[PDB]
Amino acid sequence: MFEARLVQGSILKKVLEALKDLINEACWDISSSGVNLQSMDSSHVSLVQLTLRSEGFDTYRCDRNLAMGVNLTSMSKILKCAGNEDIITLRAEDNADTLALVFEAPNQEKVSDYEMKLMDLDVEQLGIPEQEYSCVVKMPSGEFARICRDLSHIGDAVVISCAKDGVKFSASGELGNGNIKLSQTSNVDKEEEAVTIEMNEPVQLTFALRYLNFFTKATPLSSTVTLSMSADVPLVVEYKIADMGHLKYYLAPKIED
Amino acid sequence: MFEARLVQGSILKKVLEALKDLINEACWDISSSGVNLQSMDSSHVSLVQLTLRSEGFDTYRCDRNLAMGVNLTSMSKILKCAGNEDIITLRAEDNADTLALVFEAPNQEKVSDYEMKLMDLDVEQLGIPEQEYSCVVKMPSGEFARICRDLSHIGDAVVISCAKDGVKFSASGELGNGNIKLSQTSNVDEEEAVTIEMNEPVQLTFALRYLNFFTKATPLSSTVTLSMSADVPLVVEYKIADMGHLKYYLAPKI
Amino acid sequence: MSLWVDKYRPCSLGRLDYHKEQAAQLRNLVQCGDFPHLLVYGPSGAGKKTRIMCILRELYGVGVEKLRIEHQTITTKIEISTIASNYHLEVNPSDAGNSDRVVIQEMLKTVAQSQQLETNSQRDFKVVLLTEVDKLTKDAQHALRRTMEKYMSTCRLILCCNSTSKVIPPIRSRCLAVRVPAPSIEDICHVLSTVCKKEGLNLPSQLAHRLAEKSCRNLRKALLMCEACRVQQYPFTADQEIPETDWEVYLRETANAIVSQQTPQRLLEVRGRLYELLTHCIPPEIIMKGLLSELLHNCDGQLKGEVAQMAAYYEHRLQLGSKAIYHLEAFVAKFMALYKKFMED
Amino acid sequence: VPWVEKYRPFQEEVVAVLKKSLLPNLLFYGPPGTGKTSTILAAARELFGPELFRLRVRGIQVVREKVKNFAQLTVSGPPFKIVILDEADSMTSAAQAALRRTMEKESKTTRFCLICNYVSRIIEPLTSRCSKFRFKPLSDKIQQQRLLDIAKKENVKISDEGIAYLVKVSEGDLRKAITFLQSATRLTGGKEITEKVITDIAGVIPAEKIDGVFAACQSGSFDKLEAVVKDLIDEGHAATQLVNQLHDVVVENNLSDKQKSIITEKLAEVDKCLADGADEHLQLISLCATVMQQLSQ
Amino acid sequence: NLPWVEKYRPQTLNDLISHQDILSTIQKFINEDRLPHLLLYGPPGTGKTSTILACAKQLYKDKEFGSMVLELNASDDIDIIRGPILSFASTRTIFKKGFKLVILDEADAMTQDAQNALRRVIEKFTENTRFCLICNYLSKIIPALQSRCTRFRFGPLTPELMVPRLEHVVEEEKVDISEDGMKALVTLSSGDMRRALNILQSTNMAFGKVTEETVYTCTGHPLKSDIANILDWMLNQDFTTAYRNITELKTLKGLALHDILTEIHLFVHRVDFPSSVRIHLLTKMADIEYRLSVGTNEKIQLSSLIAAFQVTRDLIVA
Amino acid sequence: LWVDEFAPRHYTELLSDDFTNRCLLKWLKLPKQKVALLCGPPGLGKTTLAHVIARHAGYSVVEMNASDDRSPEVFRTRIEAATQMESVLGAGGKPNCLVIDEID
Amino acid sequence: YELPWVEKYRPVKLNEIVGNEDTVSRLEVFAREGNVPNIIIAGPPGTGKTTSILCLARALLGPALKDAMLELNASNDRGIDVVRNKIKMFAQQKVTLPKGRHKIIILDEADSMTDGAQQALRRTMEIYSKTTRFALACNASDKIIEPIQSRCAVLRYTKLTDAQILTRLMNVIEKERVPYTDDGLEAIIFTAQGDMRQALNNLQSTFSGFGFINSENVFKVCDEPHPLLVKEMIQHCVNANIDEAYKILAHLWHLGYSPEDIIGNIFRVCKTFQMAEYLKLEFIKEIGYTHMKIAEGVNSLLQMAGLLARLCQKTM
Numbered sequence A: 001m002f003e004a005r006l007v008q009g010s011i012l013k014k015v016l017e018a019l020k021d022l023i024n025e026a027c028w029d030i031s032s033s034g035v036n037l038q039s040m041d042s043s044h045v046s047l048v049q050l051t052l053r054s055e056g057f058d059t060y061r062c063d064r065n066l067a068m069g070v071n072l073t074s075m076s077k078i079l080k081c082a083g084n085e086d087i088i089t090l091r092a093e094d095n096a097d098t099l100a101l102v103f104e105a106p107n108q109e110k111v112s113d114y115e116m117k118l119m120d121l122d123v124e125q126l127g128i129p130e131q132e133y134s135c136v137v138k139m140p141s142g143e144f145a146r147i148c149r150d151l152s153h154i155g156d157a158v159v160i161s162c163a164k165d166g167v168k169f170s171a172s173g174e175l176g177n178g179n180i181k182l183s184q185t186s187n188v189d190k191e192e193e194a195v196t197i198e199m200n201e202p203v204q205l206t207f208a209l210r211y212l213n214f215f216t217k218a219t220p221l222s223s224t225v226t227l228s229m230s231a232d233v234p235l236v237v238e239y240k241i242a243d244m245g246h247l248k249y250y251l252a253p254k255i256e257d
Numbered sequence B: 001m002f003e004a005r006l007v008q009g010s011i012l013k014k015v016l017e018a019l020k021d022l023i024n025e026a027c028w029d030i031s032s033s034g035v036n037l038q039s040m041d042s043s044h045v046s047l048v049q050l051t052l053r054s055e056g057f058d059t060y061r062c063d064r065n066l067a068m069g070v071n072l073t074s075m076s077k078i079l080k081c082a083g084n085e086d087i088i089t090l091r092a093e094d095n096a097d098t099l100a101l102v103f104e105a106p107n108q109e110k111v112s113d114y115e116m117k118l119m120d121l122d123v124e125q126l127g128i129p130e131q132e133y134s135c136v137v138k139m140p141s142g143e144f145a146r147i148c149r150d151l152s153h154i155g156d157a158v159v160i161s162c163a164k165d166g167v168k169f170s171a172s173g174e175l176g177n178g179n180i181k182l183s184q185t186s187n188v189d190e191e192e193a194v195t196i197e198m199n200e201p202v203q204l205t206f207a208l209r210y211l212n213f214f215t216k217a218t219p220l221s222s223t224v225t226l227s228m229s230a231d232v233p234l235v236v237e238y239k240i241a242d243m244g245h246l247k248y249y250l251a252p253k254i
Numbered sequence C: 001m002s003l004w005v006d007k008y009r010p011c012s013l014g015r016l017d018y019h020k021e022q023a024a025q026l027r028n029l030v031q032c033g034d035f036p037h038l039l040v041y042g043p044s045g046a047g048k049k050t051r052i053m054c055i056l057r058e059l060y061g062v063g064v065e066k067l068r069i070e071h072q073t074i075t076t077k078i079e080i081s082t083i084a085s086n087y088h089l090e091v092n093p094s095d096a097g098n099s100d101r102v103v104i105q106e107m108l109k110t111v112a113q114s115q116q117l118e119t120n121s122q123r124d125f126k127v128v129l130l131t132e133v134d135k136l137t138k139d140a141q142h143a144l145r146r147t148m149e150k151y152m153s154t155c156r157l158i159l160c161c162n163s164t165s166k167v168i169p170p171i172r173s174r175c176l177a178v179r180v181p182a183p184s185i186e187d188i189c190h191v192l193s194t195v196c197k198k199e200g201l202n203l204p205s206q207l208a209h210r211l212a213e214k215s216c217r218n219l220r221k222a223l224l225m226c227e228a229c230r231v232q233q234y235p236f237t238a239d240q241e242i243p244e245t246d247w248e249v250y251l252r253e254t255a256n257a258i259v260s261q262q263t264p265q266r267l268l269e270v271r272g273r274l275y276e277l278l279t280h281c282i283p284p285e286i287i288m289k290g291l292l293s294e295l296l297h298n299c300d301g302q303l304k305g306e307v308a309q310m311a312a313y314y315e316h317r318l319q320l321g322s323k324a325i326y327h328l329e330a331f332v333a334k335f336m337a338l339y340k341k342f343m344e345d
Numbered sequence D: 001v002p003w004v005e006k007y008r009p010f011q012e013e014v015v016a017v018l019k020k021s022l023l024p025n026l027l028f029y030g031p032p033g034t035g036k037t038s039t040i041l042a043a044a045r046e047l048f049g050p051e052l053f054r055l056r057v058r059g060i061q062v063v064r065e066k067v068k069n070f071a072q073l074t075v076s077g078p079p080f081k082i083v084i085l086d087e088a089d090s091m092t093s094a095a096q097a098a099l100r101r102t103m104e105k106e107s108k109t110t111r112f113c114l115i116c117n118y119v120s121r122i123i124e125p126l127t128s129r130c131s132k133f134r135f136k137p138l139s140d141k142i143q144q145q146r147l148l149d150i151a152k153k154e155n156v157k158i159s160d161e162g163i164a165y166l167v168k169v170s171e172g173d174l175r176k177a178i179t180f181l182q183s184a185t186r187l188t189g190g191k192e193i194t195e196k197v198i199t200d201i202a203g204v205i206p207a208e209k210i211d212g213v214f215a216a217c218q219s220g221s222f223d224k225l226e227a228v229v230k231d232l233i234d235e236g237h238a239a240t241q242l243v244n245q246l247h248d249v250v251v252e253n254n255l256s257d258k259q260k261s262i263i264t265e266k267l268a269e270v271d272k273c274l275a276d277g278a279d280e281h282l283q284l285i286s287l288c289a290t291v292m293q294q295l296s297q
Numbered sequence E: 001n002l003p004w005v006e007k008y009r010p011q012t013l014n015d016l017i018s019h020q021d022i023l024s025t026i027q028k029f030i031n032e033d034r035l036p037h038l039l040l041y042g043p044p045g046t047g048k049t050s051t052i053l054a055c056a057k058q059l060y061k062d063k064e065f066g067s068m069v070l071e072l073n074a075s076d077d078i079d080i081i082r083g084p085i086l087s088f089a090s091t092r093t094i095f096k097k098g099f100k101l102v103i104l105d106e107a108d109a110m111t112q113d114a115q116n117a118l119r120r121v122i123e124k125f126t127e128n129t130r131f132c133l134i135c136n137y138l139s140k141i142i143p144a145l146q147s148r149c150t151r152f153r154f155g156p157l158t159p160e161l162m163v164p165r166l167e168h169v170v171e172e173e174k175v176d177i178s179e180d181g182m183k184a185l186v187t188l189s190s191g192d193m194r195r196a197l198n199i200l201q202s203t204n205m206a207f208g209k210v211t212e213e214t215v216y217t218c219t220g221h222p223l224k225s226d227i228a229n230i231l232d233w234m235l236n237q238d239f240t241t242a243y244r245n246i247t248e249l250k251t252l253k254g255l256a257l258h259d260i261l262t263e264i265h266l267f268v269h270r271v272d273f274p275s276s277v278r279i280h281l282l283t284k285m286a287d288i289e290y291r292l293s294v295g296t297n298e299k300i301q302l303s304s305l306i307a308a309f310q311v312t313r314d315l316i317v318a
Numbered sequence F: 001l002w003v004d005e006f007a008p009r010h011y012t013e014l015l016s017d018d019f020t021n022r023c024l025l026k027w028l029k030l031p032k033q034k035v036a037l038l039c040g041p042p043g044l045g046k047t048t049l050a051h052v053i054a055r056h057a058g059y060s061v062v063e064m065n066a067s068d069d070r071s072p073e074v075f076r077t078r079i080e081a082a083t084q085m086e087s088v089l090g091a092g093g094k095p096n097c098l099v100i101d102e103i104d
Numbered sequence G: 001y002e003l004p005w006v007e008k009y010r011p012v013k014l015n016e017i018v019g020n021e022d023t024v025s026r027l028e029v030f031a032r033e034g035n036v037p038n039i040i041i042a043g044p045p046g047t048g049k050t051t052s053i054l055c056l057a058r059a060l061l062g063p064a065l066k067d068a069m070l071e072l073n074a075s076n077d078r079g080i081d082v083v084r085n086k087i088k089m090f091a092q093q094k095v096t097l098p099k100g101r102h103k104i105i106i107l108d109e110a111d112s113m114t115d116g117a118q119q120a121l122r123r124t125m126e127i128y129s130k131t132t133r134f135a136l137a138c139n140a141s142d143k144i145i146e147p148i149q150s151r152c153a154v155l156r157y158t159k160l161t162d163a164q165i166l167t168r169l170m171n172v173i174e175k176e177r178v179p180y181t182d183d184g185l186e187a188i189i190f191t192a193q194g195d196m197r198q199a200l201n202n203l204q205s206t207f208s209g210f211g212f213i214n215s216e217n218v219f220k221v222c223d224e225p226h227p228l229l230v231k232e233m234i235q236h237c238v239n240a241n242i243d244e245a246y247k248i249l250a251h252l253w254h255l256g257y258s259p260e261d262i263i264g265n266i267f268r269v270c271k272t273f274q275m276a277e278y279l280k281l282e283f284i285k286e287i288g289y290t291h292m293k294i295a296e297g298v299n300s301l302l303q304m305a306g307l308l309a310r311l312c313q314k315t316m
Ligand SMILES: Nc1ncnc2c1ncn2[C@@H]1O[C@H](COP(=O)(O)OP(=O)(O)OP(=O)(O)O)[C@@H](O)[C@H]1O
Pocket: E004, E005, E006, E008, E009, E010, E015, E016, E017, E018, E043, E044, E045, E046, E047, E048, E049, E050, E051, E134, E135, E136, E154, E165, E193, E194, E197
């Protein structure tokens, strides 16, 4: 009977909010080492890889490898009942008919127990590799979210061009044209608002802004976001959980016109 | 070629928010004396008068007078991309199909360049005259917005009556009637002090939807000015700090 | 309040002038519980609506005659007018066109949801009288059967049509078939004489029989023609000039024109007459029926079979097609070809 | 309460073949009162047990959405839950094709037991994707016995020949004879059920009318045909019912094989024309013209 | 358990039968990097979807398949073209090079507007994405859409090649089949493996054994003997007795006038009628089938079939 | 272009033999009809008659279309402004003339 | 990778369009004069509609095409909220163009647009006529509502004749050095059905499969019920030979052709067959009735045999 304890319950709500819009149902490949999730977009364009390591949980135990599939919308609705300070515990019996979610008040005498009916998914795994990218941009997640939201007003696709000085986001549309030049931060005592870029070569790629807007839903999880991208490879948008794991989004670039 | 720099671009954002709902489309009169905007709708019910003196900008250059056809909705959507502290710079040409407006963070490693497409629109406007308004009520803008909203909860038209004691707001409709009396202070406490000067009493009825549209200029200034007369349309004026002014004119209902 | 056709419509099942046995059966049906869904059918002028109103009168109260107009809109939006009362709703969903499915669903939904407001003193259901069910579409009829079986306990349906041919078999299964035959010639004579007596008049039997035969056993026609010939001549005569509608006269003259000459010029003249008939909004099948009835009067016995078979064939093709003039015109052309060959030889 | 469900109770072998699945999609067809839904529900109770229940079924969009929400759901743990869709016979061809698509993309974990009146199924579910099982109707004697028992316990005053006629006008099923008996005892106040009341309830044309139609056709004069068809239409008798009774009479009497052949061709095409919405009066006049041509030889 | 149609659905490219020309051509396109947009059409259950899936699986490994082959069905929902299809075709790959693949099963079910939108999408992104359209009626595909792709016609499966696959099924599964049972299974299949396997399901499950009588009773198809009896009664017995015999047989075996009429049409060309008699019979039987399709009474249509043959009786004899 | 160059400048630029422009100024002065409507063949100056009558009698003009969003709610306010408020101008130009186009 | 011959030999100038000479010359006149009006382009698919409109726009606009032209396809959103929000905003846009030039809005495949969208299009076209022009395109002109056709110079396109297709096929064969025979050209032309795109696609497909272009290879690649079999079956129907006609039809059925395909080829062959014209019209009407039955769903071998019998008895 798998059971995982999580004092910081807001993390699970934030993860499910970051996943409910891009992914409709996903298979939680829950194992002893932790919780791992992978799912293609319905249009087979974007890919998301969620990792929650068991060391990050407050109390983790998974007897065998569990591969139960859940409705991310239903799971998000249930987790909406959990407060940000509630302790969340996930339980699955020896037969994964139902996943049990237990929300406990932080210092009160309120205990919420929820069970969610699962579903069967014939989903195959994906061979995402470990790769070093010709350009890696580390910027605050709020800035990336604001840039994506702003450029979604201009056009439906964004051109991410990278140079030593900074990263340039250019969009063109019906109401005109727009580009945001984001030079590398010179010297700030806090890296939480720092724009750090390490490339090996200039790279220019075009990405659909709908999927970037979906990705930016994870901004409450991590203050800073890492955008890894090289020539002819998908953009990898990475959000670091508080040492618990990561949330990585893979987006296929648009074909240049 | 025209170029203008504005340290406080939040002023431009507020102006566009104040305008984009009253008028969707506008002509932007650029001159060496500053920046002017005046538009009347086809219904000829309300005229807005936006003035931006060149001396209020950080820098200003206008080689030759040029009029830009500007989609105010598009300009507002573009200005959403600028923060309230971004230094906003405008830039154009005489044959400009596009308007170049630049948003710069206060040296915060972020520079935004936008090329906004202009309309083919060059309608000329007449200069509204200057009347000795019967009653000039200088009241807090927030109070004016609150009164307009409250009375819009009641009826589609507002009956406003002004006397030396104060100005009275009332509305009536199929739901009921409501009254708000706003008399004047003795120069007490200064943007929150209602001040009235009046020659002869006057009563007029105005649509509340256009007053609600006018009140969207509340973030521009902490005070608002109401000036009216017997057969002279109400003028609602907001002082844009020291930049200029934004005047709304509204004809009375029959 | 004045027309003979309406001044003497019987109010209750007990005062019906014909089909008295069926009226007694209907009173027995309403007297017991679990009043079913009725499918009242019969030729126009047989009394279907009269019997339905009487059925309501012994079913609900007298206030069923307190009829008041209503209008409602549907979500597709199409506005449709209705006629309702304190106990029943009468609607012709056919006039809503192809959006008859949504309007029938909405009307029955609303009436069933509204009958629950403490309206059970007389009966535990609200009657939803549908008129011209035969003019509905197949999808509308399936929606009708679904709604019928779904709200059987709260609302009752009465279906009125002239022919159950276009009513889908599933609807015929759920309903009780109330066949209302056209009155006999004798019944029409009797009701005409009773109307004249109650009017303080006297009607010769020959004129009553002539009106009954000319009405084609349509009772509203019989009453209308009786009153028209009364206002034309207060003392009735056995050979009185009984009037008839001008569309019937025009159809008869059209058939006479078809007979009198068989040429493409006469074909085009008859086509103009066919436009005149069609645009006056008389059904194409009625045109074909009257045209054949008059054409048979001008045919030899060896020709009548072929003429009738052509009439049926071309009315069938008219039902399949969309432009009635094409098939009416083809029927007229085929008939003139046949008649010209026959009279020539 | 209708007497249909009040008394709703041979084909347990299909329940046996269903239980022997340790399963295809099912297609149960037959007359409505032959217990197809009861058979599948009994097979359900036997194959899963009382604690596990199934899905029983607006168009086709809601059907597809419901089947998706139901089949894409983890079971208690037997592998294949089913969905019924009774009254499938009334589904349109587009709805049937969409249902066939819904049977796929869900066949990995769910099954469908369609219940229908036979040939209405399109070729995709009927051929392949379904295991057909025909439910024969009760024989005439058993049906008469059941009607007699119903009449006894409902104090209905109907004769034995009345019961036989009731079965005759509703040949091949109960739930139509039973409804006709209920409607007849409601119309007559139960006091007495005769031949005429059953004839009118069933929508049957009296045999005197059919005999008059044949007499007019044999007379050889088109005026008598017009009169008899006009009277038959004026009486309100359905033209399809006249076609059925006319065909039953023609196919069994001593007419020539050529005369029977011509009259039956005409009856079939008249039935097709009436199905298409053609005028009853014109179709009947043309049919009687052909019959008169054949009889007046 | 899981149905044999899914259980025995081909996986490797060598399982497919009788389509060696089509398979060789498609594989040659794969090897030479000249794979065009494909339009596979034919009768149901002849292996078009299995063919394209095998080709896609040899193109892309299992981990790369899920991100490089978008499989959609047109019967599931114009929004498909503008949503998933447009997004997939307009973007590049994730963890591979080369073209992506869209397999639009049941492409004939799209509206004409949807097919025009699909034509525009296929035209724009022909270099990066190849489309495979699978349909039953090529006539349902607008000429503009089918001019963007190479059409491969998957014909019906001949018995001489259909038999071995069913032999493998009856060897692996514990089914006892007779020679006449196999022949009847093939005949009722008529080139449809899905139909053949479903008939084998139903027969081997309900009756336990597969034989001509068993398969015909399970499918409800009339026997050759029953059709011969019906034809004999129509051509020899008088109208009333022929009607009684055929009605009794039809109600006893639950036969459909559709199937009776379909088989009698075949016998009409088998037996040697005169040319005029054959023309009359074909016209009358086509009329009967058309009148059946609308929802008429089968009693009267059956009488009309008997009539069509009774008319020709005397004409033939003389 | 050429057509709009020769638009009716005054009441004297109208063409003779026309019963439209000679019979609507009778109703348009301030016998109690409320709304207007159009019929007859197109191109007869039905769009320009109202404008030139407004020009001659000293009235203003308004125009509307289905080119913009005619939601039922916005259809209210797009005409209310044209109807029940005066003009923010000299008192002479206060009167207004209103037009609704492309309803069918 | 090489471009498909439909795109490799796509016309880039109005001079290299082998379509309708009158409409092509009219379009060249528009390109030369400059003041093009709103135009509607209707015709069969694959005749050059979109190619002509894009070539006209390119010639008119030169380098300003990228910012002066708004091209909308069936794959774009063209609802009521586009003709009112996107089309209107582009029409209001300011583009500086030469004296006789205008912004060209190409609503390609506009027959797919709804009645409401085109009603929204109506006076958006009318008002901004001073500054923008609309170039529609469709297969069926009756799908465009009356006002749009009223305010447009409706240009009609027609199926490319056999000679035009033959000339373009010669050009492509010579530029590609493709072996061929006259029978293969006739087969390609027959399978084209008056579409240049279809003719080019069939030629390229036959070249890809077999290289050589002859009738055998063409019908192996462009598989349809063979016109010779269908032709001799039609001939048997003319001679009132039901048995031989059914032999051909049953052979086609056993080959697996659907009744829709068989009846389509029957109509195509009978359209250009050697008959008395009255008998040809009788055959066409009978084939049309049978095709109506087939499309209605009654698609069996018996229906096609009944069609054959009716054709045979048309000649008595
Ligand atoms: N050549 C073949 N070899 C083996 N099985 C086959 C073959 N062709 C078809 N099948 C069987 O057909 C069934 C599924 O048919 P499939 O989808 O592959 O073909 P199809 O002709 O594309 O079908 P449809 O168009 O009706 O979807 C499976 O049971 C599969 O085993």
